[PDB]
Amino acid sequence: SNGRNDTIPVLLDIAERTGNMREFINSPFRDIYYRGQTALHIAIERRCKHYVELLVAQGADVHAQARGRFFQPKDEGGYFYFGELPLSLAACTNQPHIVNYLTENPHKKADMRRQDSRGNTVLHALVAIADNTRE
Amino acid sequence: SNGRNDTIPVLLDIAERTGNMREFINSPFRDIYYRGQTALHIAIERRCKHYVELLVAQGADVHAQARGRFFQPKDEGGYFYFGELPLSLAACTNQPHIVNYLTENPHKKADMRRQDSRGNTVLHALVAIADNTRENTKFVTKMYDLLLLKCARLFPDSNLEAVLNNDGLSPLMMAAKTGKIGIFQHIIRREVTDEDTRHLSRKFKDWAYGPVYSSLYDLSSLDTCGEEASVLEILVYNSKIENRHEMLAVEPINELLRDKWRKFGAVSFYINVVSYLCAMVIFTLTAYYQPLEGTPPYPYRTTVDYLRLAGEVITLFTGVLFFFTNIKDLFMKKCPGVNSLFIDGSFQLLYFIYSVLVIVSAALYLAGIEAYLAVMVFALVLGWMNALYFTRGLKLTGTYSIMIQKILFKDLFRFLLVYLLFMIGYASALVSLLNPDSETFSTFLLDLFKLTIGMGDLEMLSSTKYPVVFIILLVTYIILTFVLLLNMLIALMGETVGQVSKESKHIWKLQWATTILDIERSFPVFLRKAFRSGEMVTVGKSSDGTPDRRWCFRVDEVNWS
Amino acid sequence: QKILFKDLFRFLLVYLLFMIGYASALVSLLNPDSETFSTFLLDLFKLTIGMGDLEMLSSTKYPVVFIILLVTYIILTFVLLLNMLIALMGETVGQVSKESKHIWKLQWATTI
Ligand SMILES: CC(C)(O)c1cnc(N2C[C@@]3(CCC[C@](C)(Cn4cnc5ccc(C#N)cc54)C3)OC2=O)cn1
């Protein structure tokens, strides 16, 4: 709602207070359609730098691979292939600042060299989404 | 004078002082030319907001219908049709402020739902005046949205688009068959961001994930499966020919047609093609297997006679089915004219002639032994000609069919007319000179016809009364026939490709769409519901909290901005 | 290559449709062989080229109808020839002339 949800810090506080924050903050989806997607992917896609910061500072996995049927190339039954990785996701949605934060941060740094299941690195992904349209 | 006439207040004062203001303030014209027009119409047309206020504050009728011969559509002997109503008048002359005043005022409010004599609402009128010119479209679409939102907000229960005229159409349907792109696409693609009146949108945004926005269009009216006079059937059959190719390119109609093609269109068309070719192979086999010796009816005792009878009866069944399916189609659709025969109208003629020939030949086969054999030959010829109909399914073959039809019709008869003019002139020239029969004309025509092809023999030069003149005449014959051949060539090489090549794809698109819709209309009602395109999405809670549940149709896009 | 492939088979298919229709029309009218199809095919083919002899008009059961059918054969075969001319001669040069250089470039590169 208007770029801010007030229940996020409360839910995080509950997460450490119950003692199982790690299982909560990065909980992959189980359906074949959205398999592997974590809250970090949603935070990056919604274009909330502050939310991705507060989410990774609490221990979000920055290498979780969203490999569901939705996150597949258009040719193999999917609507968006962004490289199957949070860094590749922030790269493929034109989010330079979130990428800068993801590459250098005190808590956990996502290196550019990591490959997804297909082997595609960040640059293979950035090629994959490219069109011949100028924009 | 300069927007102010000082005699109006004193005239109104005289009107109430004489005790008969009511009969004066709204006095209709009596002539057939301006019948019904009141002073309120003049005040609105002259664009005097303060005058219309001062005129209605004293009791001007805001529902008086100006129905004279001048206020009629241009096609019915008139110069301006604005909806036959003061509110429709202020709407059709781009006067938003006067409309705002008329809709809400302390004295007397004119509701948007009132229909004129034709049944046209304010929105039917606003469609009627709309043109495809942009300077018209900016205010037509804008003020259509204005009036629709105002009617929704004032009256939440009713839908202003949902009231029909005396023709049964709705503003979208009326814009479909009149050829008003500017308001047609604006009606289809409209979306209302405000939650108060968002329910009357026709394009909703289902979900988004980065640069993949899947908005889904509403086809509650575009595709009714033969229940509510669908817009698509109107747009393909009864719309304006010159603009139809552009109306069929709107965002949710092209994809809808493609979906209906892949869902049940390809398989049904192809099985129809295969069945037609099989039936025609059977027809040819029956035609060849017929024995030429004997007067019908033949004694059917041999198994070969049984297969001959089976072929004959299946041919008659095919012919009667053709008659049944062609008469109904012509009965349902209007008789076409120029620029629409090349689309679809031509084939109802040809198949009609095929069925008629087969039936009359069966009638002669009943009695005439020698007679019936004449038009089996014509029947096979014409049927194998009509086999060209089904090329419209494939784009590459569909265009070439248009080539053949246009060459056979537009220029073939022109060239034949000029050619026959030369034949009659030169035949009367040559034959009248000879010194001796009536039948000599028939021989000479074929002789010259062979000479044009090159198989003519010039041995008749000896019998000519004047040998010198006939040599020159034959030379001019050959030269001018060559000139006419070059004329037909040159027309077909420049003027045809200039127009027909571009128009061929457009005509094939219309042919494909009308065949899709004919295949759909072939199915029964329950079967069509099974092959209903789109989802059954729930868009939102209604004014009472109930779900919408409107049969929408999703198309997804990729946007990087 | 494009003339041999894209349009030649289209013309052959339409022309085959026409030959089968008109041959089944003509031969079924004659009053008597199975081999008569082969003779009629070549004779009509020569007639289209112009070396066909029209001596079978005497043997026709109905002389009047066959004259009309032969006239239609000639006219619509001429129409088909005009149609092929016009198609390959407006629409092909619209596309292929531009496409020819592009295809040659790819051929040259792949041969290198
Ligand atoms: C072999 C068999 C029995 O399946 C068959 C049936 N009909 C014909 N045609 C096709 C046709 C041609 C002219 C347009 C028409 C009137 C449009 N039209 C009207 N209703 C339709 C239903 C489906 C299609 C398709 N595809 C077209 C339709 C149909 O006139 C005939 O005789 C030929 N063979």
Residue numbers in the entry:
A (entry chain C): 203 to 337
B (entry chain D): 203 to 638, 662 to 786
C (entry chain C): 607 to 638, 662 to 741
The publication says:
Transient Receptor Potential Cation Channel Subfamily V Member 4 (TRPV4) is a ubiquitously expressed, nonselective, Ca2+‐permeable cation channel that belongs to the TRP family. TRPV4 is widely expressed across different tissues, such as the skin, vascular tissue, nervous system, lungs, kidneys, and bones, and contributes to diverse functions. This polymodal protein can be activated not only by environmental stimuli, including temperature, hypoosmotic conditions, and mechanical stress, but also by endogenous agonists such as anandamide and arachidonic acid. TRPV4 is involved in various physiological processes, such as osmoregulation, inflammation, nociception, and temperature sensation, and plays a vital role in human health. Dysfunction of the TRPV4 channel is implicated in various diseases, including skeletal dysplasias; neuromuscular disorders, such as Charcot‐Marie‐Tooth disease; cardiovascular diseases like hypertension; and respiratory disorders, including pulmonary edema, osteoarthritis, and renal disorders.
One of the compounds, GSK2798745 (GSK279), developed by GSK, is undergoing clinical trials to treat pulmonary edema associated with congestive heart failure. It is a first‐in‐class, orally active, highly potent, and selective blocker of the TRPV4 channel. In preparing this manuscript, Kwon et al.[ 13 a] also reported the complex structure of hTRPV4 with GSK279, which is very similar to our hTRPV4GSK279 structure with an RMSD of 0.86 Å. As an analog of compound A1, compound GSK279 exhibited a similar binding pattern within the pocket, with stabilization facilitated by aromatic residues, including F524, Y553, Y591, F592, and I744, and the polar residues of N474, T527, and D743. This observation implies that A1 and GSK279 employ a similar binding mode within the VSLD of hTRPV4. The simulation results of three independent replicates for each antagonist revealed that compared with their original positions, GSK279 and A1 are relatively stable in the VSLD pocket, reflected by RMSD values within 3.5 Å. The resulting EM maps of hTRPV4A1 and hTRPV4A2 showed apparent C2‐symmetry, whereas TRPV4GSK279 exhibited C4‐symmetry. Indeed, superpositions of the hTRPV4GSK279 and hTRPV4A1 with the reported closed TRPV3 structure showed that the three antagonist‐bound hTRPV4 structures are in closed states.
